[PDB]
Design an enzyme around this catalytic site. Structure first.
Site, short mmCIF file in Angstrom:
data_model
loop_
_atom_site.label_atom_id
_atom_site.label_comp_id
_atom_site.label_asym_id
_atom_site.label_seq_id
_atom_site.Cartn_x
_atom_site.Cartn_y
_atom_site.Cartn_z
CG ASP A 172 -3.11 -90.27 -43.48
OD1 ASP A 172 -4.08 -89.70 -44.03
OD2 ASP A 172 -2.01 -89.71 -43.29
CG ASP A 197 1.65 -87.84 -47.39
OD1 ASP A 197 2.84 -87.81 -47.77
OD2 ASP A 197 0.69 -88.00 -48.17
CG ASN A 231 -5.92 -79.47 -35.08
OD1 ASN A 231 -5.99 -78.87 -34.01
ND2 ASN A 231 -6.42 -80.69 -35.25
CE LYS A 281 2.85 -82.79 -54.92
NZ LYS A 281 1.53 -83.30 -55.40
CB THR A 321 -2.82 -91.48 -49.55
OG1 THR A 321 -2.05 -90.28 -49.47
CG2 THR A 321 -2.71 -92.07 -50.95
CG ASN A 322 -6.04 -86.21 -48.92
OD1 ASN A 322 -7.01 -86.92 -49.18
ND2 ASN A 322 -6.08 -85.25 -48.00
CE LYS A 354 -7.01 -89.04 -46.58
NZ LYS A 354 -6.03 -89.96 -45.93
CG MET A 372 10.90 -71.78 -26.28
SD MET A 372 11.28 -70.70 -24.89
CE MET A 372 10.94 -69.11 -25.63
CD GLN A 412 -9.16 -80.11 -31.93
OE1 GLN A 412 -8.50 -80.56 -32.87
NE2 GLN A 412 -9.19 -78.81 -31.64
NE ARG A 468 -14.65 -84.61 -32.46
CZ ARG A 468 -13.58 -84.23 -33.15
NH1 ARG A 468 -12.71 -83.36 -32.65
NH2 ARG A 468 -13.38 -84.74 -34.35
MG LIG Z 1 -1.78 -87.59 -43.20
#
Ligand SMILES: [Mg+2]
Ligand SMILES: O=C(Nc1ncnc2nc[nH]c12)c1cccc(-c2cccc(-n3cccc3)c2)c1
Ligand SMILES: O=C(Nc1ncnc2nc[nH]c12)c1cccc(-c2cccc(-n3cccc3)c2)c1
Ligand SMILES: [Mg+2]
Ligand SMILES: [Mg+2]
Ligand SMILES: [Mg+2]
Lengths: 459, 454, 454, 459
Positions: free
Chosen positions: B27, B29, B129, B190, B224-225, B267, B397, B414, B417
Site C-alpha cells: 500500500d 498512502d 474505520n 492532494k 495503490t489506489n 481496492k 477522550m 477486526q 481477523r
Molecule cells: Mg492506504
C-alpha cells in the site's frame, strides 16, 4: 493472588456483582439434570441407529458402538462433501475429517479454496453445538466411513452410488437429523431414561443445598423445554434423598425449591414472542383449560417471567447449557454450563510436562534469532526443532480427544470459544461451583490480551 | 525469554515463516507515505469545513479547529440519533457521545435498549474505520455539538430544525461524507499536500534500506489506489536522499525498488474481478513499465507467485473469504506507538489496579455461599473506576483503539481477523531476518489465563 | 340515470351523506391555491437546477427546460439502479425508464427479477407522490440521461464515475431531494411566487362563493403547513375581487370566511400528537385570532365537533389507522381534468379496442379443449398493442395517473384507500346541495362485471 | 359480445396466452380432490370437538352441530375481544360478530376506534383464509356464544371466568387451533375420509378427460402437501371409472396422467428453499434411501420442478385453492380455485329481482337531486327510500350466508377479494371449467374500473 481450587472455580468473561442478582433461572436438561457420560450418549446413539435401520438403512450400522473419544462438541458438518470441520471464530478450517480419515495439509485445499468456509451458508453447513449432538456427530463419521469403505458402494464427491441411484451426504444428513429428532420426540429415549434413572442421570446432595441458599437471597425459577411428566420424574429423582437441603433436615418436594416453575418453554421463541401462557394440572400433566402460589406454568415468554417475578433483565442470572443469539426486550445476565471443562482442566494441570517443554522449545527458538536482523543472511536450520513442536502440539491436542479441545486447536481459538465469550457472563463445568462463592461476591472479568499486550511488560 | 525492544517489535496473530515469503506487496498512502500528525488531519478538516461552508453551512464552522485528542479510530456513527459509538466485538456499547456530551450509565438505554446495536445495519450505522476518517470523526461530533448548543436551532431526536427546514442527522452525515470525498477527489487536498511535502509527509532513510533488502530475497510490488502523477510525486519525495539504500551509495529512482508498480487499483474491487489492465505512459503520466487498474489475480500471474507466497503490507483492513487463494497480510497501525507508551510509562496505574484486585480476592477468600458476610467494597469499587477511567483517558477522550477496560473493541477483533502480523509501521521488519519464524502469540480464555499448569 | 356534466362531477369511493357534515376543513397549497401549470413547475425546476449548479453540478444542467409531458405523478425512483418505475397496486412493474430510455419486455428482468419490487423497501425506493414532486420527477430522469449520454462520464449499474470520483444514483437522488427542500424552505421559491401571483396562482370567483355557502350550513377551517406571511399573501390574492361572494356584495377579508385558521400545521405530525398550540400576532406575522401548530385533536375541541362530523379537503394522500376517531376526506386530483378529456375526446380508440375484443371472442366461440384449432390472431394482437400504446400516450410519456392498460396503479389504490370523495378540484362541490347523498360507485370483479343478472 | 355460459367460465384478472403454457401443475386437496359439502366440514367439526372434550372442555360442546350457513371464508378472529370480523382490503370493519350476536352501528365503535384494525398485527388477529378453516370458523362462534350465555361463566372483556381462573379468548383460540391441527395430523380425519370416500370426495369423468388433453399440449405435474399413501388412495378413487379419459377407452392408472408426481411438498417453504429432494417407494410409501421415468418424488422445491421439467415460471400454470404471498426466483403463472363461486353466481343470476329494485331505487334518488345544487336549500326527505335500500342490501347480502358474500359486503370489496386479485391470473369455481376453452385461447383481463371510469361515458 488468592484463587479458589481450579475445579471449584467460576470463570469470568464480563464482570458481575452478585448482590445485584435478584432471580436465579434454571435450564433443566444438561444443567440440573446432567446426563451420565458415556452412557446417555450411547443410549441416544443406539436408538438413532435402530431407527435408521427400520427405515431402510443396512444392518451393518447395528455393529457400530458409540465412542466418546472421537467427537468434540461444536463441529461443522459440510453436507456438500460429507466432512466434519473444526473451524475458528472467523471461518478458517482447523481440522477436517472424512469419516475417520483426517485430511489436512495440501489435500484439504483442493476441496476448500483458502482453507475457508462461509459459516453463514446454512443448509450447506450445520453447526453441531449442543450436547445432544455428540451422538449424531460420531454417527455421521461412522456413516461416511462405512459407505466409503464398503465395496458395493461407489464413492462420489458429494455422496454415494448406494445399490445405485444416488445418496448425497445432504440426504444422508437429513436422514440422521430426523432420526435424532424422532428419537427425542416420538421414540423410546425419554422412556428408557426414566426407567433406569440411576444409570443415566447424576444426583448430588449439593444441588438442593445450593438452590436452598439461593432462595434465601433471591427468587428461583425453572424454564425448561421438557414437558411436565418428564420434569416431575427427573426433578423428583434429583431431589430424592432421605433429607432436605442439609443432613438431618426434612426432605421437601422439588417444587418447594422454586417460586416459579415453567415447562414447555419453547426456547428460543420463549425469549421473543413466546407462546400463550398456560397452567398445568399437577395431578395429570394435562394442561388446565383456565389460567395461591404453588403453581406450574406452561409456554409463555421471557417477558412474562419478569412480570410475574417483578424483575427486569439486569436482575436475572440465567443458568444453562445452551448458547443463544443476538433486542429490544430486557436482557438477562448469563451463566453457561460447559461440562467438558472438568476434563480440560485435568489436561491443563496433569499434563504440564508438555506445556513446559513447548515453552522451553519456544524460548530456545528466540535465542537463535537474538542477535539477528534484516542485515543477517544466517539461515539457521530449525527443521529439527520445528518437528518436535508440531508433534508435541499434536500430543497435547490428542489428550482432549481425536477432534481436540473444545476451545482451541493449537494457537487458534475455535468458533465455539468465541461464542462462549460472546454469550456467557459466567462459566464453569457445572453451576454447582456457585456453592463455593458468597452471594455478595464480585466477579471480575479475566482480561483477554492481544499479542502486543500479552508479550510486552509494563517496564 | 528474549524479546526485541517493544518499539521495534513486530507482533503476531497467526504464525508465519518468513523464508516462505516470495513477494512483498505495498500500500502507499499511510503505509509508505505516512502522513504527519496532527498537520495532515487538520488540513483535511479545514478543507472539508471550507467545502461544507461553500455549500451553505454556517460561518461558525470556520472557527472549528481540529483536535487530535478527541477521535479514536473505529467509532460508529449512528445516523439516526447523531451519536458516536465505541462498541465491542459483538455490538455492545462501551461509550456513547452526542456531540461532546458523553452519555451513558442510565441515559443510554433510553436510546439503546439492552445497550446494544446490531452492527450490520448499514443504513443506520457507519463504521469510521480508516485513518482518513479521523477528520470526519471529529467534524461530526463538532457539528452535532454546535447545532445542539445554538439558540438559532431547535434540536430533535433525529435531527435539528434549521428554522422551518428539518435537518436529519442522517442527512447531515451524508453531507459530511460527500464533502470529504469531494475534497480528496475534486478538491485541493492532494494539491496542497504536494506543494509542501516537508510539512505533510514523514520520510526516513530506513524505508529505502528496507525495500532494498527485501528485493534481495524476494520480489517487491506497489499496489495503490492513487494515480501516477500523485504517486510519482510522493514516492520521489520519500526516496529523495543524497544517496541510495546505504550511506555512500548512489541514489536510485524510486521505481528501481519495485519489480511491479500498479496504480488506480480500485481496492477492494482490485481483489475480486478488478478492472481492465491498463499501463501508463511514464511521460504523459497517462494511459497508455508501470501498470494501471487490473486485478489481484493479474499480479500473481505477472509476478509468477501465488497466494501464500505473497505478503501484503498496508493500513487498510479488508474482508470476506480470501475462490482463488489469498495473500498473507502485514497491517500498519500507527496508533500503536502512542499506545505502547501508555503501556510502559503509566505502569503505576496498572500496578495499582492489580493491587486493588489482589486485595478484593483476599477479602472474599474465606467466604462461600454459606456466608452471610457482606464486605463493603464500594470505596475500592470507586477508585478502581477512577484509575480505570484515568488510564483510559491517557489514550485520548475516546479511549484506546483496541479496548475499553474489560472489553475488546470491534476494531481489535477486526485486526485479529484480518492481520497475520501488525506493528506501528512496516519499517519494524528491518529488525528481523528473512529466515525468521514469527510465532503466534497466544490468546487465552479466563480459565486458561487464570489457572496454572501445576 | 341522471348524472351531472362530467367536468362538474364529484366522484365517490365510499358513500357520504352531506347533511351529516358539520365542518369543512381546508388544505391551502394545491387545494385553494391551485398553482398554474406548467409555469409553477418550471419555476421549481429552474430554481432547483440553479441550486444544484451552485454546489458543483455541471453547467449543462442550466440548458434543461422542464417538460410537463414526461412526468406522471406517483412514480418510484429506484435509488439503486437510477430508474423511474410505474408500478401497480402490489408492486408489479408496468413501466421502467432509465433517463429517457424506456426499457422492458426482455431487458427488465435482467434488473428486476419477476418484474417485481417490494414497494416497502424505503431505503432503495422512493415514491414521488405529490404535485411538488413533478419537478424532481422530470429532473431526476434528465440527470440520469445526461450522465449516461456524456463522454466525460463512465456509467455503472449503481451510478456513474465523475473521473476518479464515483457518484451513486442514491447519492445523486439525495442531492436532488435536498435541493428541492432548500428551494422551498431556504431559497426564493416562495418569494418569486408572491412577486407575480398573476403568473403563478389560479383564481376564480367560485371559491369565495363556495366557501360562503359552506359557512351557512357548517363550520369552516384552514389547516395549512405554510406560515402566516405566506398564507396571508396567498389567501388575500385568491379573494381579491371587486366584490364579496356574489356580484354586487361588498368584498370581505379572506379570514372572514373561516371560523378557525391554523398555520404551521406540520402535517402529518399534525394528525398525531402534533406540536404545542401557538397563536399568531396578525400584526407581527409572528408568535404570539389565528392559531399556529397544534393538533388534529385540538381542532375538534375548539370547533366542538369530532370526526365523522368533519370533511377534510386537500391534495395530499395520508395513511395509517385514523385511537381517536378520524375525519372524512375529499381529495383534489388536478390531473383528473385532462384525463377526462382523453376518456371523452378519444372515444374512437376505446371503441376500436372494444371491437377487436368482440372479434376475438367470435373467433374462439365454437372452440373448446377438444379443438386443435390455432387461430392466428397475431395481426389483431399487434393492433391492440398500438391502440393501447397510442391511448396511453394521450396522457403523457409515462401514461395515466391511474392505470397502465389492464392494470391499476399503486396510485389508484392509494386514492381508493384514502379518499371518500374525489375530483379535479374541490370547487365542483358547488354543483351539489348540502343535503346530497353521495352514493359510492361500485367496483366490480371480473365475474361481476362480465356476467349479467339474467 | 360472445361469452360462454356463466357456470363454465374462467374469469380473467390478468391476461394469459394459453399457447405459451408448457406445464400444468396441480394442488390435490380441495382442487382435484374437492371434498363434499356440508359433509366433510361436519366430519372435521365433530372430530375437533371430540378432541376438545377429551382435553377438558365441557360436554355441552357435543351437542353443537356444524352449520354451513354461518361462516364465510376469510374472516378475522380477534383474539383480544373474541370477535369474528369481516374487513375490507384496507382494514375497515364490515361485519363484527361476538358468537352469534352481530354488533355493528355505534356499539362496535367503542371496541374498535375508527372501525379499524391492524391486519398486520399477527397473533392479535388471525385470518381464516382456507377451506379447512370453515369448521373452526363456526366452532369459535359457538364457543364464544356458549360461554357467554352459560350462567356459571362470567363474561369478561377478554375472556371468561370459567369455573374461576381465567380463560382468555386467546387461550381458547390456541386450544382450537391445536385441535384442528391435531385432527388433521394425528387424529382420525384422513382415516375416516378414506374409509368412506364416496361420502366425502367428489368424482367426475371430466377430470381424467381434461388432464389427458393437457398432456397432449404440455407437461403435467402434481405438488401436494399430503403423504403418498393418502395421495395414492385419493387419486385412485378420483380415477376409478370403468374406462380411461373417454368412454370406451381403457382405464389407466392415475400416475399415468402426470410427468412428475411430488408429495410432502411443504408449501409455502416449497416455493423458496424447500426441503431435500427424496424419492418414494411406490410399494410401501416409505421413502427410498437413495435419489426410467415412472417415478414419485418427495419434498424438494419449486426450482427443482422446473429443472426436471425443463421449464421456467412463465411456462408454468399452477392450479390450486390456496392464496400465497410476495423474489427472486422464477415466477409461476396462476389458476385459483374458489368453490363458493358456484353459489354466488346463482345469487347473481337467480336473484336479479333484488339487483334491479336497487338499481331503480338508486335511479329514483338521482332524479330528486337533478335540478339541485349548492344554491338550493331543498332538503328532500329520503329516509323512507333510504330504509328500503339498507334492507334490500341486507336481503341480498343474506342470500350468501349469515356472514355474507365471500367477495364483498355491500359496496365494499373484502380483504379476500383484494388478495384474489393480487394472487390469481385466472379463477373459477373449479379448474374443470378449463375443459370449455381451447389451449390456444387468449384470456383477456376483465378491466376493473374506478368511479370516474365506471360512471362516465365516452360520449
Ligand atoms: Mg492506504
Ligand atoms: O458436570 C458435573 N455435574 C454435576 N456436578 C455437581 N453436581 C451435579 N448435579 C447434577 N450434575 C452435577 C460435574 C462437574 C464437576 C464436578 C462434578 C462432581 C461430580 C461428582 C462428585 C463431585 N464431588 C464430590 C465431592 C465434591 C464434588 C463433583 C460434577
Ligand atoms: O366445485 C366443483 N368441483 C368439481 N367440479 C367438477 N369436477 C370435479 N371433480 C372434482 N371436483 C370437481 C364444482 C364446481 C362447479 C360445477 C361442478 C359440477 C358438479 C357436479 C356435476 C357437474 N356437472 C355435471 C354435468 C356438467 C357438470 C358440475 C363442480
Ligand atoms: Mg438444556
Ligand atoms: Mg397541499
Ligand atoms: Mg389444497
Amino acid at each position: 493472588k488468592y484463587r479458589r481450587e481450579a475445579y471449584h472455580r467460576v470463570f469470568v468473561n464480563r464482570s458481575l456483582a452478585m448482590e445485584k442478582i435478584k432471580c436465579f433461572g434454571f435450564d433443566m436438561d444438561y444443567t440440573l439434570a446432567v446426563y451420565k457420560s458415556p452412557e446417555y450418549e450411547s443410549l441416544g446413539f443406539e436408538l438413532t441407529v435402530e431407527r435408521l435401520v427400520s427405515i431402510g438403512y443396512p444392518q451393518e450400522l447395528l455393529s457400530f458402538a458409540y465412542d466418546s473419544t472421537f467427537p468434540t462438541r461444536g463441529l461443522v458438518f459440510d453436507t456438500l462433501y460429507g466432512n466434519l470441520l473444526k473451524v475458528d471464530a472467523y471461518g478458517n478450517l482447523l481440522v477436517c475429517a472424512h469419516g475417520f480419515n483426517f485430511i489436512r495439509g495440501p489435500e484439504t485445499r483442493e476441496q476448500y479454496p483458502n482453507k475457508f468456509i462461509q459459516r453463514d451458508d446454512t443448509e450447506r453447513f450445520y453447526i453441531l453445538n449442543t450436547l445432544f449432538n455428540l451422538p449424531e456427530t460420531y454417527l455421521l463419521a461412522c456413516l461416511v466411513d462405512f459407505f466409503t469403505n464398503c465395496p458395493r458402494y461407489t464413492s462420489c464427491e458429494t455422496g454415494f452410488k448406494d445399490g445405485d441411484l444416488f445418496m448425497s451426504y445432504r440426504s444422508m444428513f437429513q436422514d440422521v437429523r430426523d432420526a435424532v429428532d424422532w428419537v427425542h420426540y416420538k421414540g423410546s429415549l425419554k422412556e428408557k431414561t426414566v426407567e433406569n434413572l440411576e444409570k443415566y442421570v447424576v444426583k448430588d446432595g449439593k444441588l438442593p443445598l445450593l438452590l436452598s441458599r439461593m432462595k434465601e437471597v433471591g427468587k428461583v425459577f425453572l424454564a425448561t423445554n421438557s414437558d411436565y411428566k418428564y420434569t416431575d420424574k427427573i426433578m423428583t429423582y434429583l431431589f430424592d434423598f432421605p433429607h432436605g437441603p442439609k443432613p438431618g433436615s426434612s426432605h421437601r418436594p422439588w417444587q418447594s425449591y422454586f417460586d416459579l416453575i415453567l415447562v414447555d418453554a419453547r426456547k428460543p421463541l420463549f425469549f421473543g414472542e413466546g407462546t400463550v401462557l398456560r397452567q398445568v394440572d399437577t395431578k395429570t400433566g394435562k394442561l388446565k383449560i383456565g389460567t395461591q402460589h404453588g403453581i406450574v406454568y406452561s409456554g409463555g415468554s421471557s417477558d412474562t417471567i419478569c412480570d410475574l417475578l417483578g424483575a427486569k433483565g439486569k436482575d436475572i442470572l440465567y443458568i444453562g447449557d445452551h448458547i443463544f443469539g443476538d433486542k429490544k426486550r430486557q436482557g438477562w445476565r448469563t451463566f453457561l454450563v460447559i461440562p467438558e471443562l472438568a476434563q480440560e482442566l485435568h489436561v491443563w494441570t496433569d499434563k504440564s510436562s508438555l506445556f513446559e517443554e513447548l515453552q522451553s522449545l519456544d524460548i530456545f527458538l528466540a535465542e537463535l534469532y537474538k542477535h539477528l536482523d534484516s542485515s543477517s543472511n544466517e539461515r539457521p536450520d530449525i527443521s529439527s526443532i520445528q518437528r518436535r513442536i508440531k508433534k508435541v502440539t499434536h500430543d497435547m491436542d490428542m489428550c482432549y480427544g481425536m477432534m481436540g479441545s473444545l476451545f482451541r486447536s493449537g494457537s487458534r481459538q475455535t468458533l465455539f470459544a468465541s461464542q462462549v465469550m460472546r454469550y456467557a457472563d459466567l462459566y464453569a463445568a457445572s453451576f454447582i461451583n456457585l456453592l463455593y462463592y458468597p452471594f455478595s461476591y464480585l466477579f471480575r472479568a479475566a482480561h483477554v490480551l492481544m499479542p502486543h499486550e500479552s508479550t510486552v511488560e509494563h517496564t
